[PDB]
Design a protein around this ligand. Structure first.
Ligand code: THP
Ligand code: CA
Length: 130
């Protein structure tokens, strides 16, 4: 079982990265197990807008680390991010705005959950899958 930790919004970045204050440190969090298009790729601006609004509209922001690496080689936090209890990683995938991606054995607690979301988005031919 993982645990959710409080964090506070600093600023949006793009569909799968967000800047949060965590334990008094400004950190870029990269979302586990997903990949949104880069900002100037198709669906890029939409995935950016979706993550940005989902986070900044939530009263309660939380980060949840997995069991393995907590930071990548760039110093970004690797986490599942929750906004009023809804997981952003999952919501992007469900809406066809991110693919399941960067799936590593240390750090794949929510893999089945996100794959179930992805299969729904592909069935519906949403966005990336249209
Ligand atoms: C999601 C994720 C990305 N990364 C690294 C892999 C890629 O590094 P390399 O470019 O060195 O191969 C990079 C992709 O992030 P972005 O999709 O944000 O560009 O982030 C991890 O190390 N672990 C992860 O869980
Ligand atoms: Ca990306």
């Amino acid at each position: 079982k993982l645990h959710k930790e409080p964090a506070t919004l600093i600023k949006a970045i793009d569909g799968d990265t967000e800047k949060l204050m965590y334990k008094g440190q400004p950190m870029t969090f990269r979302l586990l197990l997903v990949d949104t298009p880069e900002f100037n790729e198709k669906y890029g601006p939409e995935a950016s807008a979706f993550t940005k609004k989902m986070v900044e509209n939530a009263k309660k922001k939380e980060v949840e680390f997995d069991k393995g690496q907590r930071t990548d080689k760039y110093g970004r936090g690797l986490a599942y991010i929750y906004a009023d209890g809804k997981m952003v990683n999952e919501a992007l995938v469900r809406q066809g705005l991110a693919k399941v991606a960067y799936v590593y054995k240390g750090n794949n607690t929510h893999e089945q959950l996100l794959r179930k979301a992805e299969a729904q988005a592909k069935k519906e031919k949403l966005n990336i899958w249209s």
